[PDB]
From a paper:
Mitoribosomes are essential for the synthesis and maintenance of bioenergetic proteins. Here we use cryo-electron microscopy to determine a series of the small mitoribosomal subunit (SSU) intermediates in complex with auxiliary factors, revealing a sequential assembly mechanism. In this study, we determined sequential cryo-electron microscopy (cryo-EM) structures of stable assembly intermediates and initiation complexes at 2.8–3.2 Å resolution that involve six factors: RBFA, TFB1M, METTL15, mtIF3, mS37 and mtIF2. In conclusion, the model for the SSU progression through the assembly pathway includes a sequence of binding factors as an integrated network, with RBFA serving as a regulator through its allosteric control mechanism, which was not reported in a bacterial counterpart.
To explore how the SSU progresses through the mitoribosomal assembly pathway after maturation of TFB1M, we reasoned that an inhibition of the corresponding LSU assembly would allow the SSU to proceed towards later stages up to the subunit joining. The structural analysis of the SSU assembly intermediates obtained from the MRM3-knockout model suggests that disruption of the LSU assembly affects maturation of SSUs. To strengthen the structural data, we performed metabolic labelling of the nascent polypeptides in the MRM3-knockout cells and gradient analysis, which detected no mitochondrial translation or monosome formation.
Numbering used by the authors:
A (entry chain 9): 14 to 137
B (entry chain D): 61 to 274
C (entry chain 2): 47 to 92
D (entry chain Y): 63 to 243
E (entry chain U): 2 to 103
F (entry chain 5): 30 to 423
G (entry chain s): 89 to 125, 135 to 433
Amino acid sequence: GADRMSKWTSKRGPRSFRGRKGRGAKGIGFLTSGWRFVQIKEMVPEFVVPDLTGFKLKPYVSYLAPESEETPLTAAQLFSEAVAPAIEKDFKDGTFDPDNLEKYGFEPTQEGKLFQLYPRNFLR
Amino acid sequence: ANFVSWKSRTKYTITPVKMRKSGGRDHTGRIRVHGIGGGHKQRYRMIDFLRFRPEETKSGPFEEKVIQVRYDPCRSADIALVAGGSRKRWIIATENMQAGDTILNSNHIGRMAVAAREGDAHPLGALPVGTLINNVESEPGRGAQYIRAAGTCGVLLRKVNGTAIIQLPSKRQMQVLETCVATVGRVSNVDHNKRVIGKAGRNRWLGKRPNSGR
Amino acid sequence: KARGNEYQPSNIKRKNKHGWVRRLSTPAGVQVILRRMLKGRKSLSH
Amino acid sequence: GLEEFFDDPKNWGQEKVKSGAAWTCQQLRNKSNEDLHKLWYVLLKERNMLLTLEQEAKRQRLPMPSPERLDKVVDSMDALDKVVQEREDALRLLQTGQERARPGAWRRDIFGRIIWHKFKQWVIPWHLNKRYNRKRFFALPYVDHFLRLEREKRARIKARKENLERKKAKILLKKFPHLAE
Amino acid sequence: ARNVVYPLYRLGGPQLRVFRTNFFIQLVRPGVAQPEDTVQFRIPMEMTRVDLRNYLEGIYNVPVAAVRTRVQHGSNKRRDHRNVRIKKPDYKVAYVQLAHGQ
Amino acid sequence: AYEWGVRSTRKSEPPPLDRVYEIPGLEPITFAGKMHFVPWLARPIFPPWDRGYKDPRFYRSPPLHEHPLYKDQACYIFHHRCRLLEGVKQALWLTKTKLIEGLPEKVLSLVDDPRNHIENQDECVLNVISHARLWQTTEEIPKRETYCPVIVDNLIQLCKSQILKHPSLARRICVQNSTFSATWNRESLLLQVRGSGGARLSTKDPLPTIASREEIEATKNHVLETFYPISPIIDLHECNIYDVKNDTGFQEGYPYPYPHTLYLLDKANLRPHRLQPDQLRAKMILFAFGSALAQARLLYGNDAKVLEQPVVVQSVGTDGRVFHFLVFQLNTTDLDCNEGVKNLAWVDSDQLLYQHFWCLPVIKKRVVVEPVGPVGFKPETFRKFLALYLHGAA
Amino acid sequence: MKYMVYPQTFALNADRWYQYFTKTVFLSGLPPPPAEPPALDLAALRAVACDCLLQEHFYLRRRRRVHRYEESEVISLPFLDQLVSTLVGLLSPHNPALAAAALDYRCPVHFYWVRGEEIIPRGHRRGRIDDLRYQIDDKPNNQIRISKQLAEFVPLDYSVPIEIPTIKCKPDKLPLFKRQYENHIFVGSKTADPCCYGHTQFHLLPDKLRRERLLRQNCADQIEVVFRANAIASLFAWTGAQAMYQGFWSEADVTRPFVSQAVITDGKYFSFFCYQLNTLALTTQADQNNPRKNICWGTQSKPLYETIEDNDVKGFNDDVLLQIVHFLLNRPKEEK
RNA sequence: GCUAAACCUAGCCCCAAACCCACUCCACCUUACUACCAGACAACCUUAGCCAAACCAUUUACCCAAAUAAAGUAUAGGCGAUA
RNA sequence: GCUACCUAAGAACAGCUAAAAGAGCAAGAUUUAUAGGUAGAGGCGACAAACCUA
RNA sequence: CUCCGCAUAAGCCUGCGUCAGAUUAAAAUGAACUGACAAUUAACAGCCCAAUAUCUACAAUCAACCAACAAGUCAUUAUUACCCUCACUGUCAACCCAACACAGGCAUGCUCAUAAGGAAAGGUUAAAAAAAGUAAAAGGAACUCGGCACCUGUUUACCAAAAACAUCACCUCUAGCAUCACCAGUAUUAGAGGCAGUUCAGCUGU
Ligand SMILES: [K+]
Ligand SMILES: [Mg+2]
Ligand SMILES: [Mg+2]
Ligand SMILES: [Mg+2]
Ligand SMILES: [Mg+2]
Ligand SMILES: [Mg+2]
Ligand SMILES: [Mg+2]
Ligand SMILES: [Mg+2]
Ligand SMILES: [Mg+2]
Ligand SMILES: [Mg+2]
């Protein structure tokens, strides 16, 4: 008699089932003695909203705009525009040496960084 | 959930321990012994059967005072709360055990037969020949496994070459070393057999359901 | 006197008896899931 | 304020509201990260206003004014995510050489299927994790036969589709004989 | 944000921040009579009332006194021509009370 | 000897290790690299894992011996939940005190004259009993966990109305949640008393000494009775991690440092949880002794000498219906030896305020046999209660 | 089914909604002085007030650590008990009634009443008239019950131009929730108790409503609302229960006012309220042409002290303390 | 005159040839589709009965790498059936 | 999830004779909610060779 | 009329709210069917807790007196560790399991006759037969298979009888022992068996 096809949700089942299951909201704390909930400020996502005053970009773009070819960014293109110039200058001056990759922005490891690329430890 | 034995407590205590009935089923959940089921809820009192168990620091013979003698739902005999030093424990009560009495537990074999005092625990070899004994152990330090029921008492027939011959309540000779502790006297509730159940309903209270063979 | 009312719905019983975790608990139950996957069942289990 | 959720009071009631084109990925790619961050909230407030108007139109049982505005805003925000994701993706490759942001591994499951298992974050090591260890990332021999039946089921479906395509081609030639080639 | 892994927080770690939230909300007309200081929203399932208060205050600069939410069940009664149930999606409803007597 | 804990309930023994570990120079290939178990690879051996930081909700405490306060010599602590097997007799030995049946003449004398009795005392006391046992809550029959605290509080409030007659009663306060600690040695046994629970009646002035020096010296002849084969420290918490410190319960400068009276409540609904009459009196002696000892050690230091100015502390113990009264004088702080001057304790026991209470009328054959209200009320008990309260202010 | 009315509530602007449910008009300040055509030892009362404030905060040694979320129940609650229990004893010579009064500790006060009607919106009972039922289950920290009623603050037919607030939506939007359970009318003791009249009530606001939390929740204007809502609900429930203990009800309205006083504090800030119950005819029928209104007087919360450093209380406000004494010195008028 | 009737596609079957499958994001072995705590449960072991012998009791079949032929031959078998 | 038995932890039972508590008239070898266990060469059965979702 | 009703639990999952409909019930207002729109807001409830050692003989019954037996839901301390806060989820209905003439089933609290909840008659006629109810001269079971008035426990039947099984007692049988049943038991124990009212008077459409 039970409905197998319908989605299983916290509305279904007895009181124990309904309390335990949630709707996908991320937890922001823990439960202590007496079912008291302690909210951890750091767990609560902090919205980083910028100052939009004096900002020229708007939701839409004027139709009188030169269409351009789509060129997705690649790791090579980023290297040629952000890292290649510094190495090219140093190589001419002979200052460049392999041991000093970090001078041009290379990170040997992600440990100790606030925003680590892999494994990603920051929200969108 | 599969059967888990309630007998999981590892530390001795005099506090009654909550018991779980089996209903005649083994760990497989199938009936092994028929006619077992229901009854009144019972709490287990950890009975100490190694009468001669001195305290951790102390050693040698010691004495205990009978604080209380009370009914036990888990056995036919009555039990006695005995306090010695800073430790209390549950023991089996003798026929004349009473509150306030002092009892002795010794593991010393005298050159002769020490005077037999009810409720004391001496080595079989020390006990006089032809004395009613109870709570006898097969091996030194094993703990009393025999003559533990209400009103039961074995006799020490003879002591020969470091061994003792005792008559079990079933009139069967048993031979044990002379360093095996035992308790002088009959077990409490000598009139246990006399009691009449009277009503079929009483059997259900004792946790015994109908058993039909065919 | 009642007839045809064998079903006494209980979500706890239904999940425990026929649930996903129950099926995976034994090799026979896993094969139950495999057969239903092969047949293309919309609901593999309760 | 709360009025940001609604369109310019002048526009209320107007059958249409003229709007510009959606941002393209190339246009956004020229902008800086700080500009994209500010543009996101500019687009976000516009999207919330349009979503609000769309719902009120249903409540009033009337058509939504200029519904294509919502399609444009969703296109621009999707493009903004792609442009920002590409920058992070390219940066990750250079610094770590990792294709994906989230660690994972190819695993076999209890059903014998090969799956990409995305890793979750834990405070304790896996060998001490009671719940994680209950999961079985292997299949036993009894799964082998079902894998063969599943493979043969896949082959039957593929064979039917290929056969049908060839049949349709013959029907096409029957109706259009010049297509013989 | 929704459909994104949250960086696990350990005691004493940095604050969790979301630079480009993908939460989109709808301000809606109440179906029934509400107090003057009450504003009703439809928000995503994953958005908590704490998120909504920060979301409105941070992005819209709306002082929020109280926030309450509930999960509205969407009817699954409708059947298509194949006699297959059609699911109206469940959505979350939020009730926001404006601060400062607004 | 029968061992407790059946094998089936004990943790299963580790599986037999793979034999590849036995072979020297061979590295067993394990599933540790896979990060999950597989039956066809050897089980890894994992090094003990440490979190590396502090996480309160998952904290583990160090081994007991490593604790900073761990001591090789055990200390026996008496607390509110300690139930003495020998009751008062054990308490008398532990505190090196002599027991005198009844209360002192000085205390009782205060209530001897009618001018000290409260107006309509019997009517007022009867209302207190009816309020706590019948009227206080919506429940038909209030339970001991509620009526026992209320009856004592109201009785103290009834005695507090005499501030009009005796203005000195303004110099006393009733303190809740106060705790005191006193440590002393008896026959080389380290003893401690951690006092908690009940109400502490505090006064700005010390109580007068009940017994003169002549009576204090007469105690030398008295010999502390002993119980054998029961230890004096039975039913006490044998503690190995402890601090040998003396605490009256308040920091320096408290306007009411002197513990006038200690009120102890046996407010347990279940009879087994409730203390026995003799056990409750034993708790009163130790708590009264503990409070007095804490005062003596504070004023006169940690030395073990006969006190020139003894300390008097009173205690009242009740379960809501039965009251026990105690006056304790700390004559000596030299407790290590049985011989010498001994402390004096005046104990009045098993004083019933009322025999029984009927919350509902008893009806037999549709006739009201017994009406609701206190049964067998004994106003004498309250006079003893009033006498202890008036003591030191009248 | 009835609405659970919580005197200590988190609902925004609850005081306005509670005024409608109880038909209560709220006035600022205290009631006009009682017209009338053993000195008070202020130095001894200030000392005792500071000896209770410093015992809990400083002198008393705590075995365990007191966390911020326990202060209200570990420090504030015991302080209020002693402050009341000691002032009543010290002031008993000045006010004879206190000597025979009954002092309660966290005793329940219940009041059940009907106010207004509704049309059942849904179900098999849709369209039928149903009474709007309300229940208050209060638990004041301390309360003083006397055996003789206090004097009224204004006449029974006292009227004011201030209108009673109305609501344009259902009470559920406060928010308010309905539950069905025992309907209790309780003054803190059963009817048999001779002490069936109310003197003063002492309320400690819960930690959830602490001033600090309200400030960071953008609810600074709600600080005074919490105090007012607590007083209106609690004193209405208490006086209403007292009137129903004398046989009065909606169809047999009170023939004399029923007054009571409340002191509402969070452990540092104190508020003083006076309530006069003039009518119980609150049902649509009984309240058809009923001109009587219930009156509640209240003051703005003031700090008793500013800070406590070690054993020194800095900033003790005698005005707040004297106001507590004035409430405790109110006595039932004696007969000729 | 109603009810109806009529239809040609959807796809499917058998071969041949080629060795197939599958990580947007998020969720999913706990009550699957559930962000976030000291694991420990671990897989391996003759297929059976029976088509037939007109019953049934030993006895017959379902795989191991080249179509054909040797050959239904050698051989096995209540020397029966049959293999 | 029926039913039989059992386990865990719950719950219900007016009046009347009323000593005795008892299917007396109208508190028990009673009834009952919840979760769990025992499975077909079997289980369970105050044994009808009954019952174990016809 | 009330047989209930309201609420909770369990189950169920939008399933008589608004608007519209050409759909639907006997019914071209109603609508539980279709389309669109709206809705149930936490205080109630669910969702809990740092470690190690240690503590926990005294039922309940108005718990007092007098009592018992089947022997019982209710408790800590020591030291270490810990400064933070109100998230998440259930909340609608004329509703479930059934049966398809409610045939029936369904836990708890409160109300104890309702302040809540409901409608036995589509209209007519007033034949038979049939069902139920009521009244009935004289008689009062006549004529009819048969009217009405060695303990205990289940069973078919029911006023019931009977037998069967169970079982107190009784009897024989096997067993000298412990860490999963028996049993945390020990021959005064455990298990397996056997146990051999009529007549009369009175009343009734029988
Ligand atoms: K439903
Ligand atoms: Mg909610
Ligand atoms: Mg709650
Ligand atoms: Mg509801
Ligand atoms: Mg009605
Ligand atoms: Mg009808
Ligand atoms: Mg008809
Ligand atoms: Mg007749
Ligand atoms: Mg005849
Ligand atoms: Mg006759």
